[PDB]
Design a protein around this nucleic acid. Structure first.
Lengths: 235, 125
RNA sequence: CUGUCCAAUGAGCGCAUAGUGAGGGCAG
């Protein structure tokens, strides 16, 4: 027992729970800060950028462009659009108490995010070691998902591709491989056959990996490029 | 010529002929599953007479789980040199790296299957 | 039918679905 893969599976799940809570906090933080500076959300689309920007700005919008740390967070073009939009914002300064609670949740969120990254890294590193080739094809994360359900690299390899495409499924017959990045970077029309294709190659990659071969991912890479080429063909 | 040491046990030219004949006959009698994937299924399901693999398969690891499944289920497995050759015996214009002769009810092929099984069990030492 | 491209290292199918398993594109 104590197989490392189960550790990584569960670390990878945390990551999803932290993504969820971060999404919720962003929504909260947007809503609360709406009164100070209602136009900003439209200007800073990236949640984390938005939260970092809010933490930086605070109660005083004026002079935002002049700030040297905000220059670190947003593009100069954007800094200038927000600065100009600040001068004509229709929102009132916040109470000491609402400002303070806003800052508290902003801090909470950035701390959450740092831990999120720390875990993402850990999952990447260990997955690249546990299934170098598999990882290369679908990413550490998806790979960890299909390993968790399967119950390890050996139990996964003893599976036929068609069942590996069905893992984590419950429009139709879409499981983890379908919801993978590589598959999702295609137009919906091509996703089903793309999922089929990725599954097949992941089946090959898992088997190599069960025997601790091509430990530098050569196979994973060949397979990936072979998969990407067909993607190009269909375009 | 040399084959990956890992493709064990490899059939010589005589056994190779018999194997491919029997595979071809099984394709006709419909007791033949073709492809590493479908061969895996027949093993998990418990309906495999014996397994035949191409030592041609690259990376060889893509079929190496089969001998493991086999050892557990007590199913004979053998290698031949050529996946193009196996392909042809499976009716397919394409190379076939693994295939399974499945159990069938009152098979005419029974005696021949039994005979092939024994030959393969001999090579396992 | 014929030519060609793809395809058991999985074509096509898609609540038989922990499944299916040889066929498909294009051109005459």
């Amino acid at each position: 027992a104590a197989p490392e893969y189960r550790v990584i599976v569960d670390a990878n799940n945390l990551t999803v729970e932290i993504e969820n809570e971060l999404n919720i906090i962003h929504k909260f933080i947007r809503d609360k800060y709406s009164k100070r500076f209602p136009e900003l959300e439209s200007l800073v689309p990236n949640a984390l950028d938005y939260i970092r920007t809010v933490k930086e700005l605070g109660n005083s919008l004026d002079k935002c462009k002049n700030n040297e740390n905000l220059q670190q967070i947003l593009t100069n073009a954007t800094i200038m659009v927000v600065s100009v939009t600040a001068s004509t914002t229709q929102g009132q300064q916040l109470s000491e108490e609402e400002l303070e609670r806003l800052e508290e949740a902003c801090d909470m969120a950035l701390e959450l995010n740092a831990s999120k990254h720390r875990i993402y890294e850990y999952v990447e590193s260990r997955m690249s070691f546990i299934a170098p080739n598999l990882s290369i094809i679908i990413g550490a994360s998806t790979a960890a998902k299909i390993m968790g359900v399967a119950g390890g690299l050996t139990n996964l390899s003893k599976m036929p591709a068609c069942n590996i495409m069905l893992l984590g499924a419950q429009l139709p017959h879409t499981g983890y491989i379908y919801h993978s990045d590589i598959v999702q970077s295609l137009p919906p029309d091509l996703r089903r056959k793309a999922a089929r294709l990725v599954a097949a190659k992941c089946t090959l990659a898992a088997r190599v990996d069960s025997f601790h071969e091509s430990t530098e991912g050569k196979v994973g890479y060949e397979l990936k490029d072979e998969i990407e080429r067909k993607f190009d063909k269909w375009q | 010529a040399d084959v990956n040491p890992k493709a064990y046990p490899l059939a010589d030219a005589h056994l190779t002929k018999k194997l491919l004949d029997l595979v071809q006959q099984s394709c006709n009698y419909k007791q033949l599953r073709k492809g590493a994937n479908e061969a895996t299924k027949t093993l998990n399901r418990g309906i495999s007479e014996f397994i035949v693999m191409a030592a041609d398969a690259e990376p060889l690891e893509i079929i190496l789980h089969l001998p493991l499944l086999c050892e557990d289920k007590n199913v004979p497995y053998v290698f031949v040199r050529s996946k193009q050759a196996l392909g042809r015996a499976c009716g397919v214009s394409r190379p076939v790296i693994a295939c399974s002769v499945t159990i069938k009810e009152g098979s005419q092929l029974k005696q021949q299957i039994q005979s092939i099984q024994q030959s393969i069990e001999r090579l396992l030492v």
